[PDB]
Design a protein around this ligand. Sequence first.
Ligand SMILES: Nc1nc2c(ncn2[C@@H]2O[C@H](COP(=O)(O)CP(=O)(O)OP(=O)(O)O)[C@@H](O)[C@H]2O)c(=O)[nH]1
Ligand SMILES: Nc1nc2c(ncn2[C@@H]2O[C@H](COP(=O)(O)OP(=O)(O)OP(=O)(O)O)[C@@H](O)[C@H]2O)c(=O)[nH]1
Ligand SMILES: [Mg+2]
Ligand SMILES: [Mg+2]
Lengths: 249, 28, 430, 426
Amino acid sequence: LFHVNKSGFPIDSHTWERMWMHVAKVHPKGGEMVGAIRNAAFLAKPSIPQVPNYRLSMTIPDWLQAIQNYMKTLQYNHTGTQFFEIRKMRPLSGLMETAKEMTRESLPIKALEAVILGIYLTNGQPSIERFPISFKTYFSGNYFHHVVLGIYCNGRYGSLGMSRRAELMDKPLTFRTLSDLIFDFEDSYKKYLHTVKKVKIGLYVPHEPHSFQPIEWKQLVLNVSKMLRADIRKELEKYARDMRMKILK
Amino acid sequence: SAQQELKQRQRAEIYALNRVMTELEQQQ
Amino acid sequence: MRECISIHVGQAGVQIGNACWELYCLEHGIQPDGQMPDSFNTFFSETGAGKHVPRAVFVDLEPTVIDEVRTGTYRQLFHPEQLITGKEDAANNYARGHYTIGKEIIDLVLDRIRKLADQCTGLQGFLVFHSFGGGTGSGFTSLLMERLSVDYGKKSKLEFSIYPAPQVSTAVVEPYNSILTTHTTLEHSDCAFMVDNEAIYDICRRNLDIERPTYTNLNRLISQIVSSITASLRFDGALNVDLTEFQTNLVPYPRIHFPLATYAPVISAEKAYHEQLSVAEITNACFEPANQMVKCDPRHGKYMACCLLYRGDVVPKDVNAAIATIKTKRSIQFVDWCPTGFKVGINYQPPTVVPGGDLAKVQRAVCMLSNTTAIAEAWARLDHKFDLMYAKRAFVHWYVGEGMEEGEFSEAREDMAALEKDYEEVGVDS
Amino acid sequence: MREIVHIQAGQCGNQIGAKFWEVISDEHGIDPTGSYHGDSDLQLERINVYYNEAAGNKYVPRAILVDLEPGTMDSVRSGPFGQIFRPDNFVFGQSGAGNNWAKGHYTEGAELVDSVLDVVRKESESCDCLQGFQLTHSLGGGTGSGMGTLLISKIREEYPDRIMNTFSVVPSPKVSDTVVEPYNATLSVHQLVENTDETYCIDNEALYDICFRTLKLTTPTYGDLNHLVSATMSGVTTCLRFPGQLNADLRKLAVNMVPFPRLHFFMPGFAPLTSRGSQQYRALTVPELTQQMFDAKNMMAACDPRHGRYLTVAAVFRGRMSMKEVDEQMLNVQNKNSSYFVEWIPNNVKTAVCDIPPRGLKMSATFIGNSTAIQELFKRISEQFTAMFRRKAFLHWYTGEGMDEMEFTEAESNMNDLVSEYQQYQ
Ligand SMILES: Nc1nc2c(ncn2[C@@H]2O[C@H](COP(=O)(O)CP(=O)(O)OP(=O)(O)O)[C@@H](O)[C@H]2O)c(=O)[nH]1
Ligand SMILES: Nc1nc2c(ncn2[C@@H]2O[C@H](COP(=O)(O)OP(=O)(O)OP(=O)(O)O)[C@@H](O)[C@H]2O)c(=O)[nH]1
Ligand SMILES: [Mg+2]
Ligand SMILES: [Mg+2]
């Protein structure tokens, strides 16, 4: 499994050599390009993507699109080594500090820190409202998990996130219902012959950055595979109504 | 002084390496 | 043969000490003039003819509060030399209290400490009372604690401070004082018990049903907690816990010794009749978030170690039962590296109620101390305050004009960041 | 200990100071013969702040009186509570300044400055712990505007470590009884910025509006305005003399309210001000006092607080009152009016509470604000200055006293500098 940087910055010797051993092992050709990049005297300096700023004139779907293209520009991590250690139960303010230092450094990003970045970017807009979604799925005799960030601006459901695949990480605000969104995710997942087993939905995140409220991820959980989609849709629409009225607590 | 150059080198090499493995995943 | 001496600095410290010594004189039966009409030995010295002298040192750079005590109803209690006074206040300035105006008085107090600690045989520690926001309670406490730490290396010192509240405040330069005092409170003291005014205001408004409480009520509550802490030294019970025992039980690592206190049952004389107030009830009342005397929610943290000082009519089986029901609850989250996290202590003397105050004459009460990780919020907010002002260099010229150096402002901030980081990195799983 | 020296210059300063001494003496229970006929012991406890004991167990104010026209001393000694001052503290000139700044600072003001420094020095060694000085004067003149600045400059040379508290009355545009106000005003505030720690600007227009609209007076003479100013002055220095739940002397206010060294010009307030007819239709509670303090119509300087933010605020309450009431009131007052307060100062109110209210009330509160709206006044003065200085009107009189012309340009430059500095934080 992919390992996590924990020495702050810069990267310590142990994690450095561990990552290089990992990439040497997995890469079939292996040592040639690895050693070439190690002993490369000069390499092209990557540019710094500029953090976009909210503007009132331009519309909110284009805002979500803009954050999505910036995230795409940030070169999604497939090196197999996390660079910013995240804790689920940690209070929100620590995650805001993590998000702002991550934007300062602008390194490769995975799904969890991608949705944290999305929360950090969208925290400035009371009209926009966002929450997490998680899937636990089954394929090839092993279980895998994925996480994305849903949005409910202007009475419409949309999705942001990251993945090595293309269509599993970005949807627009064009969904009347949350059920249509999650079933679209299920169909895209089936397109790769991966079976979703369980689906989990949390809560709207508070709009105050400097707070200690933790992020909820398990407030709703279903076993999607066993049950027929009608009951799933009914329970999900009940839950969406319970959420947008702020009743759940 | 040299610390910032170290971060520069680190991000440059890791960016290039990530490009290489993205190409490999395209191969896969 | 078991003692501790009390130092009250600044207006807040002196005013809390007023209530504290009222309470202690009430508990042991000492008249206001110090004449009784051997459990008093912890706080009082007998000097022939039954005269009782508190082991207190009242200090303030400004003479008005000390003069108020000199003219008050306890003029005959303290002997006159203890009440030390300056000429002009620190004026909410750390640099005046520490460097400029503190130098002229510090020797005159230190020797007095050297006198008092030379009268006792066995001494357990010090009970310092101060406030973070003030210029006296910060700078003068810094100087005094530095001098004592270099003097008595291995005597525990217990600060009982008053941390600034998040929203309620009565000064413009509080963050600069608190951040500067964070260096002395760490690394010199042994157990600092933070307290807010907003939390106790809420407690008095809700539990006691008082719409217009003033500082006297807050001082009475804090006095009750301190008298509960220093109770196993004066009376006897099933389990006894002196200073060093609960110091070893609480402080896991040397650099995190900031517990937050609690008390129960706080109820008015009218609601007492409709209440049973058993051991289980009061034990459960300590853990709800609406009773913490620091404006922070303990539900967003974990308890490292806890200490439940019971007093009154209690027996250990009830305490074990209550601790069991607490451990069953999943809302109250403890830390994995502390499988047992309760230091129990029972005492036979019940609480005492001052006649002029407003608290029910209950039969048993518990004081709960918790070394929880939720305290960092109470710090974090204040750092933000500092960050908003120091960015513009606002008010810095007042501090640098009194000989203070500017780099200390950034050094204190990075020290506080290190403290918060260390406090957060523990409590992680495994 | 922590004593204060009080100095009065000009007719306006002398009259306001006479009213101030009458108010202070009444508050402490001092007879106009100087004897004591009070009731409590708190009155004697800190009487040395403003008084010196004398043989026969009487008390003499620690006050110095100066003018260049002996009529003002005659009126002051004749008037009520004029006998308490000892005669040797009065000093007078031969001929008044004639509203000439250069005359009261260079020509005839120098020939009398030595006596005032001598008596001030003699009074400053009649104590042990001196907190600071305080001076009442008017910027629109020659005897208060020039001699006053000369005096504070000399004293600040002598005692760099103390504080000064100038309660200056600024000239108003509409209520003007003089033709050469801008020249004197600018020439004085050139020197007030550097040699003073707290300047409380007062305007006659705002005072007249307070008497007409709030107190519903028909014919407000100068006595009523002087009474209001005296009430403010007595409110400022109350924590030095009486005990309270949260004390605050002069230096505490200075450090709380002066974020930067040059931004030390304040405009005070006062509450409760109620007419005789509307006495019984009010509850006299802390919310009422706080609402009346922050009212735009309650400011003592003719400026609109809505046209600018508050850097820092202070409020010295007076009476037996809860602290939760005060804290919640000065919290929600900031909550509702977030637009009127500066964002880069998290807390803008330095609240203090005393226990002994004024004689005829149960509760009072002296409001002192440091807003960016004060510079309005200065711009108006600058306009009038550049209206007259362009054509060199009335200017030969000042040059005839040995004053040079470039000083006017320098003072105008300082005026633009200070106004820009206040404009910056907005
Ligand atoms: N609130 C008050 N304002 C006053 C009072 N007297 C004057 N003022 C104002 O002061 C302004 C001028 O004050 P002064 O007469 O003292 C000028 P000064 O005497 O210092 O110079 P000389 O006349 O040359 O002696 C005048 O425009 C009035 O509007 C007063 O008694 N109370
Ligand atoms: N609980 C409680 N807090 C108080 C009391 N008096 C003052 N405070 C707190 O003290 C803080 C201000 O600091 P002070 O202690 O008054 O400063 P100081 O010790 O007098 O030192 P100086 O400023 O130099 O006079 C305020 O924020 C109050 O919350 C009191 O009687 N009880
Ligand atoms: Mg004080
Ligand atoms: Mg005159």
